[PDB]
Design an enzyme around this catalytic site. Structure first.
Site, PDB file in Angstrom:
ATOM      1  N   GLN A   1     -41.650  11.212  29.308  1.00 42.32           N
ATOM      2  CA  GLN A   1     -41.341  12.048  28.151  1.00 42.32           C
ATOM      3  C   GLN A   1     -40.525  13.286  28.510  1.00 42.32           C
ATOM      4  O   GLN A   1     -39.383  13.435  28.066  1.00 42.32           O
ATOM      5  CB  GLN A   1     -42.639  12.457  27.449  1.00 42.32           C
ATOM      6  CG  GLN A   1     -43.207  11.365  26.579  1.00 42.32           C
ATOM      7  CD  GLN A   1     -42.295  11.024  25.421  1.00 42.32           C
ATOM      8  OE1 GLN A   1     -41.867   9.880  25.269  1.00 42.32           O
ATOM      9  NE2 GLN A   1     -41.994  12.019  24.595  1.00 42.32           N
ATOM     10  N   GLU A   2     -41.098  14.177  29.312  1.00 39.61           N
ATOM     11  CA  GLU A   2     -40.502  15.477  29.610  1.00 39.61           C
ATOM     12  C   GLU A   2     -40.374  15.587  31.124  1.00 39.61           C
ATOM     13  O   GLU A   2     -41.281  16.081  31.796  1.00 39.61           O
ATOM     14  CB  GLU A   2     -41.351  16.609  29.024  1.00 39.61           C
ATOM     15  CG  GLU A   2     -40.700  17.978  29.078  1.00 39.61           C
ATOM     16  CD  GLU A   2     -39.748  18.225  27.928  1.00 39.61           C
ATOM     17  OE1 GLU A   2     -39.821  17.486  26.924  1.00 39.61           O
ATOM     18  OE2 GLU A   2     -38.926  19.161  28.026  1.00 39.61           O
ATOM     19  N   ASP A   3     -39.246  15.118  31.652  1.00 42.95           N
ATOM     20  CA  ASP A   3     -38.969  15.115  33.088  1.00 42.95           C
ATOM     21  C   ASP A   3     -40.085  14.412  33.861  1.00 42.95           C
ATOM     22  O   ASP A   3     -40.734  14.977  34.743  1.00 42.95           O
ATOM     23  CB  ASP A   3     -38.744  16.538  33.605  1.00 42.95           C
ATOM     24  CG  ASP A   3     -37.428  17.125  33.136  1.00 42.95           C
ATOM     25  OD1 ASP A   3     -36.480  16.346  32.902  1.00 42.95           O
ATOM     26  OD2 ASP A   3     -37.342  18.363  33.002  1.00 42.95           O
ATOM     27  N   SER A   4     -40.302  13.151  33.498  1.00 44.75           N
ATOM     28  CA  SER A   4     -41.216  12.270  34.208  1.00 44.75           C
ATOM     29  C   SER A   4     -40.635  10.865  34.180  1.00 44.75           C
ATOM     30  O   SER A   4     -39.748  10.557  33.381  1.00 44.75           O
ATOM     31  CB  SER A   4     -42.625  12.291  33.601  1.00 44.75           C
ATOM     32  OG  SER A   4     -42.612  11.839  32.260  1.00 44.75           O
TER      33      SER A   4
END
Ligand SMILES: [Zn+2]
Ligand SMILES: [Zn+2]
Lengths: 372, 116, 46, 48, 360, 434
Positions: free
Chosen positions: F300-303
């Site tokens: 999702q958010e830098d993963s």
RNA sequence: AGAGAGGGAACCCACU
């Protein structure tokens, strides 16, 4: 560094003399052996072994002594101390070895070296930036009382003493000098070991140049541009009271970091400051008066050009104005002080063991811990 | 002269008369460098033990007593330069003091210490 | 009771004693390497 | 000194009285998870 | 008159500095570089620096040139003030002694026999030795059998003995030491040292009366204290002023039924209440016991404090049943039911039943 | 540090080619700490005496023999900052000095001449610390790097024709930052030497290749010009952190925090500069089949979502080594460390852990599993009051670092600088990507 | 079935 600079440091140190029959010590020829560990026998210490056993991959440093008491005796290859060696140097064990030989020594050929092994820890000397020495710069302290300030971080190469920055500043006060008579801006110089703002003309008179015409010749190289002469006119007219070299030097000695006693011992201190403190890169000698005058005139001329705008101001972040102190200059700067401290300890030992009337033991005079 | 100066720190003794501090060798070989003519301790060790002190406090290297305020306070201005003692513990026997008084030399004590 | 060490550069093995200075008998090499343990090891092949 | 022991951001007033080390606290990396509610945090077993 | 100037010197080498300065003055008194100073003072007890008598500081600097022991006062000199110059030369001042040097420093030594040669005296000491057992220490009795057993430098003459650096002992050391190496004035040993070989105590808050004078029978509380003539300031009953009384006039008088402690003697450390105050016999009962304790009035003080008066642990196991079957591990913790196994393969320690484990 | 000004931190124009523009620590030391460019070389400095002798050989007038009237109509000449004299004809003097530098007759290649033309100055710098970089020499709008140089340069180890031979040939030379202010630098020869609507047609030097303006860590970035500059800086920070085979002899080194990888790979998409950093011989990273897709919601958010089966096949499965060093101290008999297996009945203060993992000398044999708070070094220090009872030397032992576990890789026993016994234990723990 | 831990200060590199 280890090929030339160390010898330069050893030779540039004065031969220490002690006054009783006098005797002096001199160090002339240095010797740098291969890294070797020991209690134990001298054996070549491979760098990986020094890394595993938390040793220091350092090579011993010998030097020859010559003392004249005169009765001269030489002492070849006296152990000064151990200095560290970065790997893949010209004095490391694995210099020019083939990759097969390196793999036999448990050292990879991929390792670029360039790091010291100190107590088994790999150390990297980070290159340190600095302002380029012996170069005139014109900056603008817009918050101070100076309009344009010139500087020259003068540092003679192969000189144990550090740099000594001289400033040639111009008092701004664009209008009046907070007076009913001070019209123009006056150029003033901040010399090393002198706490007051010395005028430029005072220094030029103190250099053996009494005439205003001669000083103007050394400052302004054209007499057909009256604008620059008019700008330098107030600074020239500040110090028309002092006309003699004697009085100029006396005013130089006034308000120093070491204040003078009387007219005597203050003329010599001012002469010492003008001889060995400001501008060492133009020479430190009796005949270097005119060369120093020429370079100071160049500094004032460049300041006048900056005040005119004919030459732009200098940038502190331009990388032509910077130097990079690598392992060479850094270890040289370190070795200057520590070699001087070793000489100081030897002098203390000699002072202790001449007052007893006996002869000193030179092996005990040079202690190896202060240098290693 | 240098003959008055003690040669070492061992067995330093101060005179009971002029508080002259010298080694026992110098007292044995030279006597007193100021008033041996009145004491005559040269050539006799027992005379030295009777006329010198084993307890002294403070030393003064009196170099020019003719222009010294210390010599005025210690009353050693009319003597010769040398090593003197500030406080001296000891006293001459009555026979020596009486003999000195018969020669016109009253014995003033050098014990200038503040005893409590 | 003695512990067997591998003599570094020599790659040979020798006994050691308590409070014994660490030296090889071949060339006196100072670095010894302890032999692999004798107890069993079992590894999940994951 | 005592004044140096109290005056700093690492002293007694700020560093020890205002912001102090506390028991019953855990610190580990966060990774996203869209299958639990907004008021739910998925903590590890070794922390719990 | 010239003035005295302080010159810092090497510690412990001030007298030698004065001697060297005198030799230098005599050696150059006829030359063209004379010492224009007047005298040099190196006191007996002032350690660290000496004094130079001169009219100028420049004379002091030019006179101490070439002397290395004074190099720490070469650059600057400090003059002794005019009013303080007399303080420079001002000097203040079968028995027991205490040794100055050695391992027996300041230890009680009984002067056994005074040798009339005025060089040394025989001293009775308690040995601070380890009997050549640790060195390759407190005071304890001299054990001759132990030093005969351990050997070394030891010679036996019954109870007489010589050991470890010509130390002479008998039954108790008996060794000669110099008079200048001991202090023969101001030891004053205690009762415990007697077994080995007036006083005033007024405290603030205590109650005292007046036994003689025009201010007799005035009881007041103690405010301050001094050594011999205290000039106390007692807060008497119904008197807002502070009078003055020395120590010889006062006495520790206490009303019947108050906190009392004993300062010294056989009854020290015990507290309680006094019952009836006689002329000098003051009887009291303790906080611990109800025994009669009769004390002198001086041995009482007013203090209001209360009286004191498994087998599987560390065993390589093999999970022989369950999902983890075949894993080799080491038991960290074990119980009657389960046991934690540190798996050799994974980076995890898991607990399994003891019935599922099989040791190697 | 912690200065609110920006001028000492900014990327100045004179950082071109000498220092990498992208690589820098992005914390509170932006711009202050820099990384050197690839071909940039710091001049080690030589003595100015041969230069002064050469100048006195030609018609250079010293300061102690001049009139102050002919100074303004001539060029002032400096050496290492100090003003050595005047010269009347600046041209044919700079030409002569350059002609000697293109031949290495007297002046070393590192020494730099700068002719200030607007103001009549000519300064020669021989200092130790100047930063320069080699550039091609453009005589006419023609490079001096002819085809014969390439022919002799391809056949190295046979003709013994090195880079220094090309420097001696007067084809390339080192230009420092001062001299870059007075040089017309061609970017590439295929564009800036052919006739067009002419830009300058007065080039003096030509850049060898623009990719050499970057540092060591900015050279491993594929297509760094297509990225954004902050991204290049952040990658330069991360590139010195990627796991991989940091050294070839890692099995001998007793390094602390050794991060090595199972199956490192060279990048499929590489630069020409990786051949000279030897990044293809000691790589750091694995080529992975990535897909840029929105999915279940864990990237999702830098993963990133990883493949469990691939990881089970050795994908990024690293191994982490940690060494533990300990020596005993022979002292004045009051406290005496010694390596031995401590006993509960004998030693005092012994912490509750497994001591049977130790061998008879108080050390762990290699190949033994240890975990958090497991002893690795059995060392006991004596107690001075053992006689001053029945309780003797106290435990002074180094445990395995808590919340860590793994197998002991190897143990070395030796002597230190002081001659005391000294042991290092390297513990191995593989790290499966989770 | 015998049960607690201590160092402390200084300085470098990164991490968000
Ligand atoms: Zn006398
Ligand atoms: Zn061997």
């Amino acid at each position: 560094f280890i090929q030339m600079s160390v010898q330069r440091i050893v030779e540039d140190a004065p031969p220490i003399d002690l006054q009783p029959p006098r005797y002096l010590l001199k160090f002339e020829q240095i010797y740098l052996s291969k890294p070797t560990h020991w209690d134990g026998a001298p054996s070549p210490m491979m760098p990986n072994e020094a890394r595993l056993r938390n040793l220091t991959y350092s090579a011993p440093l010998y030097v020859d002594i010559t003392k004249t008491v005169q009765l001269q005796t030489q002492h070849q290859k006296t152990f000064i101390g151990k200095i560290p060696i970065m790997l893949r140097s010209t004095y490391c064990l694995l210099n020019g070895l083939t990759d097969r030989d390196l793999c036999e020594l448990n050292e990879c050929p991929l390792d670029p070296g360039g790091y010291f092994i100190i107590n088994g820890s790999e150390k990297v000397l980070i290159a340190q930036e600095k302002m380029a020495t012996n170069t005139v710069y014109v900056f603008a302290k817009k918050d101070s009382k100076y309009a344009y300030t010139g500087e020259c971080r003068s540092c003679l190469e192969n000189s144990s003493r550090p740099t000594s920055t001289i400033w040639v500043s111009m008092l701004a006060r664009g209008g009046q000098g907070a007076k009913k008579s001070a019209i123009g801006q006056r150029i003033v110089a901040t010399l090393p070991y002198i706490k007051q703002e010395v005028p430029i003309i005072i220094v030029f008179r103190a250099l053996g140049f009494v005439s205003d015409r001669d000083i103007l010749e050394h400052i302004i190289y054209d007499f057909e541009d009256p604008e620059m002469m008019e700008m330098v006119k107030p600074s020239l007219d500040e110090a028309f009271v002092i006309q003699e070299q004697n009085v100029a030097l006396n005013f130089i000695g006034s308000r120093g970091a070491k204040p003078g006693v009387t007219k005597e011992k203050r003329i010599k201190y001012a002469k010492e400051v003008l001889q060995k403190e400001m501008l060492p890169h133009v020479g430190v000698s009796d005949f270097c008066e005119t060369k120093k005058a020429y370079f100071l005139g160049y500094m004032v001329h460049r300041l006048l050009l900056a005040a005119l705008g004919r030459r732009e101001l200098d940038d502190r972040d331009h990388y032509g104005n910077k130097r990079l102190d690598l392992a060479g200059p850094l270890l040289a700067f370190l070795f200057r002080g520590m070699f001087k401290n070793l000489l100081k300890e030897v002098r203390i030992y000699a002072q202790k063991f001449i007052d007893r009337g006996k002869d000193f033991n030179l092996e005990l005079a040079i202690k190896t811990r202060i240098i290693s | 002269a240098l003959e008055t100066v003690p040669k070492d720190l061992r067995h330093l003794r101060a005179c009971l008369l002029c508080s002259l501090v010298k080694t026992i060798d110098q007292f044995e070989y030279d006597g007193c460098d100021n008033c041996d003519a009145y004491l005559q301790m040269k050539g006799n060790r027992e005379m030295v033990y009777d006329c010198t002190s084993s307890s002294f406090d403070g030393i003064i290297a009196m170099m020019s007593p003719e222009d010294s305020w210390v010599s005025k306070w210690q009353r050693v201005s009319n003597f010769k330069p040398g090593v003197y003692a500030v406080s001296v513990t000891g006293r001459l026997p009555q026979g020596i003091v009486r003999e000195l008084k018969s020669r016109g030399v009253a014995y003033k004590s050098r014990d200038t210490a503040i005893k409590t | 009771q003695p512990m067997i060490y591998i003599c570094g550069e020599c790659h040979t093995e020798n006994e050691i004693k308590s409070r014994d200075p660490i030296r090889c008998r071949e060339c006196g090499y100072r670095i010894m390497y302890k032999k692999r343990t004798k107890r069993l090891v079992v590894f999940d092949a994951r | 000194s005592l004044k140096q022991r109290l005056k700093g951001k690492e002293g007694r007033v700020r560093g020890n009285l205002m912001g102090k080390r506390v028991d019953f606290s855990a610190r580990t990396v966060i990774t996203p998870d869209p299958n639990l509610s907004i008021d739910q945090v998925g903590v590890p077993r070794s922390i719990a | 008159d010239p003035n005295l100037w302080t010159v810092k010197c090497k510690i412990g080498e001030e007298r030698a500095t004065a001697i060297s300065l005198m030799r230098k003055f005599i050696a150059y008194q006829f030359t063209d570089t004379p010492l224009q100073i007047k005298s040099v003072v190196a006191p007996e007890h002032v350690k660290g620096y000496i004094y130079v008598e001169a009219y100028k500081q420049t004379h002091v600097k030019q006179a101490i040139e070439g002397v290395g022991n004074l190099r720490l006062g070469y650059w600057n000199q400090q003059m002794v003030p005019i009013k303080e110059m007399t303080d420079v030369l001002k000097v203040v001042k079968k028995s027991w002694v205490r040794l100055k040097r050695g391992i027996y420093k300041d230890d009680i030594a009984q002067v056994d026999y005074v040798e009339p040669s005025q060089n040394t005296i025989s001293l009775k000491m308690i040995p601070r030795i380890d009997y050549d057992r640790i060195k390759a220490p407190p005071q304890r009795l001299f054990d001759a059998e132990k030093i005969r057993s351990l050997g070394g430098d030891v010679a036996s003459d019954g109870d007489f003995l010589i050991f470890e650096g010509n130390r002479y002992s008998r039954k108790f050391l008996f060794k000669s030491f110099a008079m200048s190496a001991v202090i023969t004035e101001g030891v004053k040993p205690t009762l415990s040292e007697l077994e080995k070989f007036r006083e005033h105590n007024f405290q603030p808050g205590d109650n005292v009366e007046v036994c003689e004078g025009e201010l007799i029978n005035l009881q007041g509380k103690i405010l301050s204290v001094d050594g011999n003539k205290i000039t106390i300031m007692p807060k008497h009953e119904d008197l807002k002023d502070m009078l003055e009384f020395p120590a010889q006039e006062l006495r520790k008088y206490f009303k019947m039924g108050d906190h009392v402690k004993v300062i010294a003697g056989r009854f020290e450390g015990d507290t309680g209440l006094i019952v009836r105050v006689e002329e000098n016999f003051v009887i009291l009962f303790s906080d611990l016991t109800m025994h009669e304790l009769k004390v002198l009035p001086r041995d009482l003080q007013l203090c209001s404090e209360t009286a004191s008066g498994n087998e599987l642990i560390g065993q390589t196991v093999r999970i022989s049943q369950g999902p983890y079957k075949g894993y080799i591990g080491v038991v960290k913790d074990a119980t009657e039911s389960t046991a934690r196994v540190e798996l050799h393969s994974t980076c995890q320690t898991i607990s399994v039943d003891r019935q599922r484990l099989t040791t190697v | 540090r912690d200065g609110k000004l920006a001028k000492p931190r900014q990327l100045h124009n004179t950082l071109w080619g000498m220092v990498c523009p992208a690589e820098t620590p992005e914390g509170h030391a932006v711009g202050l700490v820099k990384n050197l460019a690839l071909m940039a070389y710091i001049s080690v400095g030589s003595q100015p005496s041969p230069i002064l002798e050469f100048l006195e050989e030609w018609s250079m007038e010293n300061l102690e023999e001049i009139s102050p009237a002919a100074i303004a109509d001539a060029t002032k000449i400096f050496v290492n900052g100090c003003w050595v004299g005047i010269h009347k004809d600046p041209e044919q003097l700079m030409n002569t000095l350059r002609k000697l530098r293109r031949q290495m007759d007297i002046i070393v290649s590192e020494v730099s001449m700068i002719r200030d033309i607007r103001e009549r100055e000519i300064r020669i710098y021989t200092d130790a610390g100047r930063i320069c970089r080699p550039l091609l020499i453009v005589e006419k709008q023609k490079l001096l790097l002819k085809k014969r140089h390439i022919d002799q340069l391809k056949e190295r180890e046979y003709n013994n024709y090195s880079w220094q031979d090309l420097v001696a040939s007067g084809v390339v030379e080192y230009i420092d930052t001062l001299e870059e202010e007075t040089v017309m630098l061609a970017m590439t020869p295929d564009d800036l030497q052919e006739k067009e609507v002419a830009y300058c047609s007065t080039y003096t030097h030509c850049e060898i290749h623009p990719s050499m303006i970057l540092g060591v860590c900015a050279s491993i970035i594929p297509f760094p010009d297509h990225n954004q500059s902050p991204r290049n800086t952040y990658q330069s920070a991360m590139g010195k952190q990627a796991m991989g085979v940091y050294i070839t002899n890692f099995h001998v080194r007793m390094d602390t925090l050794a991060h090595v990888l199972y199956y490192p790979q060279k990048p499929l998409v590489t630069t020409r500069s990786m051949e000279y950093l030897r990044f293809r011989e000691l790589p750091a990273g694995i080529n992975s089949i990535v897909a840029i897709a929105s999915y279940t919601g864990y990237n999702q958010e830098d993963s990133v979502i990883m493949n469990r089966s691939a990881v089970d096949r050795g994908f990024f499965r690293s191994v982490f080594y940690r060494s533990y060093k300990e020596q005993e101290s022979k002292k004045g008999f009051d406290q005496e460390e010694v390596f031995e297996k401590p006993t509960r009945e004998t030693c005092q203060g012994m912490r509750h852990a497994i001591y049977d993992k130790l061998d008879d000398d108080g050390l762990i044999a290699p190949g033994v599993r240890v975990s958090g708070d497991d002893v690795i070094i059995g060392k006991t220090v004596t107690l001075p009051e053992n006689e001053d009872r029945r309780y003797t030397k106290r435990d002074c032992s180094t445990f395995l670092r808590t919340s860590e576990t793994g197998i002991v890789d190897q143990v070395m026993v030796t002597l230190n600088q002081e001659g005391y016994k000294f042991c290092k234990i390297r513990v191995r723990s593989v790290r499966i990507p989770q």
